[PDB]
Design an enzyme around this catalytic site. Sequence first.
Site, PDB file in Angstrom:
ATOM      1  N   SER B  46      -1.248  -8.179   2.225  1.00  0.00           N
ATOM      2  CA  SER B  46      -1.186  -6.808   1.750  1.00  0.00           C
ATOM      3  C   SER B  46      -0.639  -6.601   0.347  1.00  0.00           C
ATOM      4  O   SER B  46      -0.743  -5.527  -0.158  1.00  0.00           O
ATOM      5  CB  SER B  46      -0.425  -5.896   2.658  1.00  0.00           C
ATOM      6  OG  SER B  46      -0.889  -5.915   3.988  1.00  0.00           O
ATOM      7  N   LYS B  49      -2.933  -5.181  -2.186  1.00  0.00           N
ATOM      8  CA  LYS B  49      -3.216  -3.766  -2.367  1.00  0.00           C
ATOM      9  C   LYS B  49      -2.925  -3.306  -3.808  1.00  0.00           C
ATOM     10  O   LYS B  49      -3.480  -2.329  -4.276  1.00  0.00           O
ATOM     11  CB  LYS B  49      -2.484  -2.889  -1.325  1.00  0.00           C
ATOM     12  CG  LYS B  49      -3.066  -2.999   0.105  1.00  0.00           C
ATOM     13  CD  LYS B  49      -2.529  -1.897   0.978  1.00  0.00           C
ATOM     14  CE  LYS B  49      -3.039  -1.943   2.395  1.00  0.00           C
ATOM     15  NZ  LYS B  49      -2.485  -3.072   3.126  1.00  0.00           N
ATOM     16  N   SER B  94       0.445   0.698   4.341  1.00  0.00           N
ATOM     17  CA  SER B  94      -0.327  -0.584   4.190  1.00  0.00           C
ATOM     18  C   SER B  94      -1.534  -0.601   5.089  1.00  0.00           C
ATOM     19  O   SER B  94      -1.783  -1.530   5.874  1.00  0.00           O
ATOM     20  CB  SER B  94       0.587  -1.793   4.388  1.00  0.00           C
ATOM     21  OG  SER B  94       0.199  -2.955   3.644  1.00  0.00           O
ATOM     22  N   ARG B 226      12.699  -9.308   4.703  1.00  0.00           N
ATOM     23  CA  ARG B 226      12.087  -9.394   3.339  1.00  0.00           C
ATOM     24  C   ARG B 226      12.957  -8.602   2.375  1.00  0.00           C
ATOM     25  O   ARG B 226      13.468  -9.133   1.400  1.00  0.00           O
ATOM     26  CB  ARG B 226      10.684  -8.862   3.389  1.00  0.00           C
ATOM     27  CG  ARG B 226       9.720  -9.742   4.170  1.00  0.00           C
ATOM     28  CD  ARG B 226       8.339  -9.181   4.350  1.00  0.00           C
ATOM     29  NE  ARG B 226       8.396  -7.866   5.002  1.00  0.00           N
ATOM     30  CZ  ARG B 226       7.326  -7.140   5.278  1.00  0.00           C
ATOM     31  NH1 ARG B 226       6.117  -7.560   4.953  1.00  0.00           N
ATOM     32  NH2 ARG B 226       7.466  -5.988   5.893  1.00  0.00           N
TER      33      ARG B 226
HETATM   34  C1  LIG Z   1      -0.570  -6.638   4.996  1.00  0.00           C
HETATM   35  O1  LIG Z   1      -0.185  -7.742   4.727  1.00  0.00           O
HETATM   36  N1  LIG Z   1      -0.806  -6.292   6.287  1.00  0.00           N
HETATM   37  C2  LIG Z   1      -1.049  -4.932   6.561  1.00  0.00           C
HETATM   38  C3  LIG Z   1       0.284  -4.416   7.093  1.00  0.00           C
HETATM   39  N2  LIG Z   1       1.300  -4.545   6.037  1.00  0.00           N
HETATM   40  O2  LIG Z   1       2.503  -4.120   6.231  1.00  0.00           O
HETATM   41  S1  LIG Z   1       3.677  -4.778   5.525  1.00  0.00           S
HETATM   42  O3  LIG Z   1       3.348  -4.617   4.114  1.00  0.00           O
HETATM   43  O4  LIG Z   1       4.940  -4.174   5.859  1.00  0.00           O
HETATM   44  O5  LIG Z   1       3.764  -6.211   5.571  1.00  0.00           O
HETATM   45  C4  LIG Z   1       0.674  -5.178   8.303  1.00  0.00           C
HETATM   46  C5  LIG Z   1       0.714  -6.577   8.087  1.00  0.00           C
HETATM   47  C6  LIG Z   1      -0.547  -7.118   7.471  1.00  0.00           C
HETATM   48  C7  LIG Z   1      -1.615  -7.241   8.426  1.00  0.00           C
HETATM   49  O6  LIG Z   1      -2.744  -7.248   8.033  1.00  0.00           O
HETATM   50  N3  LIG Z   1      -1.322  -7.467   9.708  1.00  0.00           N
HETATM   51  O7  LIG Z   1      -2.183  -7.662  10.489  1.00  0.00           O
HETATM   52  C8  LIG Z   1      -2.850  -6.513  10.948  1.00  0.00           C
HETATM   53  C9  LIG Z   1      -3.934  -6.851  11.897  1.00  0.00           C
HETATM   54  C10 LIG Z   1      -3.370  -6.696  13.238  1.00  0.00           C
HETATM   55  N4  LIG Z   1      -1.957  -6.528  13.018  1.00  0.00           N
HETATM   56  C11 LIG Z   1      -1.986  -5.693  11.862  1.00  0.00           C
END
Ligand SMILES: *C(=O)N1C[C@H](NOS(=O)(=O)O)CC[C@H]1C(=O)NO[C@H]1CCNC1
EC number: 3.5.2.6
Lengths: 241, 241
Positions: B46, B49, B94, B226
Amino acid sequence: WQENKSWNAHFTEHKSQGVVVLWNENKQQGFTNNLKRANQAFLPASTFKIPNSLIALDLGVVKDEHQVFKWDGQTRDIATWNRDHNLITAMKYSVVPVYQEFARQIGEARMSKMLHAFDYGNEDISGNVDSFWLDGGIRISATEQISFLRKLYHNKLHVSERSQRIVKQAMLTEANGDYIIRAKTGYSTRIEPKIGWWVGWVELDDNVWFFAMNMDMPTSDGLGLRQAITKEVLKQEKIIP
Amino acid sequence: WQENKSWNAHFTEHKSQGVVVLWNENKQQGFTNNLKRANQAFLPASTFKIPNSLIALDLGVVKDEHQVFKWDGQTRDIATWNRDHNLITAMKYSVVPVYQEFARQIGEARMSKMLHAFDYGNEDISGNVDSFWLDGGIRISATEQISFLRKLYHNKLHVSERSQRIVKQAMLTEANGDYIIRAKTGYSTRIEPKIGWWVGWVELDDNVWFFAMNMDMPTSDGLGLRQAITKEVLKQEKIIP
Ligand SMILES: *C(=O)N1C[C@H](NOS(=O)(=O)O)CC[C@H]1C(=O)NO[C@H]1CCNC1
Ligand SMILES: *C(=O)N1C[C@H](NOS(=O)(=O)O)CC[C@H]1C(=O)NO[C@H]1CCNC1
Ligand SMILES: [Cl-]
Ligand SMILES: [Co+2]
Ligand SMILES: [Co+2]
Ligand SMILES: [Co+2]
Ligand SMILES: [Co+2]
Ligand SMILES: [Co+2]
């Protein structure tokens, strides 16, 4: 503008007198504890840094938010003013002499025309070019600050999109996972009545609430109350937790 | 980059392993607890983004930060995704499917040109157009994140100034009278090793400190570490109170 006298509890509580005005952008409805004072026009004082910034950026007096305005060497009674500044820090510490020099460079003809374009209060710049918003002829009410801020929020003022975005950056006061506040404080003391201002808005995920407040401010001891009372009202209306 | 292994205590006390990378903009100096891991490249997940937003804005796929991307009606496992969004809230929560729609419209040709222009990690977009940053061939290290973010900070990427300012607004995470953080989190889970990211910067009155961290993240119960570990580093270094 609907009246809600129950916000006076928060002023009484702190032996204070003033007005808070709120505007719900999605519902297009406004609220205040005092309709008459909401519409009373006062010297804007340091709240004028909003328009003054927009104008200085639009005309190229300020190149961007990093350009440094070097302290002139004169030591003044607020310690943070005695040092180099950029736009961000000049707003944060409300550094008047930096904005007085922008105003001189803008000049009274461009200033007046911009304030008409912005519909800013009474649109009167009578007085010194470099202090009219402190001790000159300009006046604006809490409701007119909201009208003005809404246009800024939507990039509808007659200056570049870029100037507007920069100023909204420089307004950033607070942010967390619940909200963002962009705002400017002010303290009118040169000409009676001595009053404190806070104007700006709260951004939520799916709405924005504009605010403008002013209050009697006999001495600088009570300035924390500008924000504290506003926030008490925001809390009561469930805008912020 | 100078090594400062004393930051290891903050990973250790949290039963964790990772790297924090810091860059002092005024002094042009970098610091990390782990020079090797600092340079080790991973899927951005993410954190992608940030560039994806820039590209979408620059090409007009996204008109502005108010444009509403309607929920597609499919119920996904993160509840905040199952609602309408704009750029600001899509970044905050996100919202991957919103960004997958961007990637599709951008298309592979423009995406690849843009990532070359950005010097984004290994500049490799192999995999599905809609998920290469989650399970394809792109890889970027913590130090490469910093290099990229410095460009964005200075508006030096090959996209409009407007796009860069809009993305920096959307990255806004925290602000108060001490600092402003603009940043983006990520969690790479599709391909081992599973790692969490936080990348961005801290703006002070007179300097900016860039940061990029990643850490091993076997499950989602350590995600708040984090920011927690990063902040403990920042506080040890006196960058924030
Ligand atoms: C980004 O890395 N993503 C999207 C969301 N990001 O949130 S976070 O920035 O706090 O890390 C969630 C984690 C990640 C993601 O894609 N996770 O997987 C998705 C698919 C099913 N679970 C959510
Ligand atoms: C603005 O109204 N100013 C400049 C400073 N603003 O701070 S504030 O935004 O928190 O209210 C301080 C008040 C006011 C001002 O001009 N005060 O006068 C100066 C002249 C010498 N005393 C301070
Ligand atoms: Cl901002
Ligand atoms: Co109260
Ligand atoms: Co008029
Ligand atoms: Co008139
Ligand atoms: Co007139
Ligand atoms: Co710069």
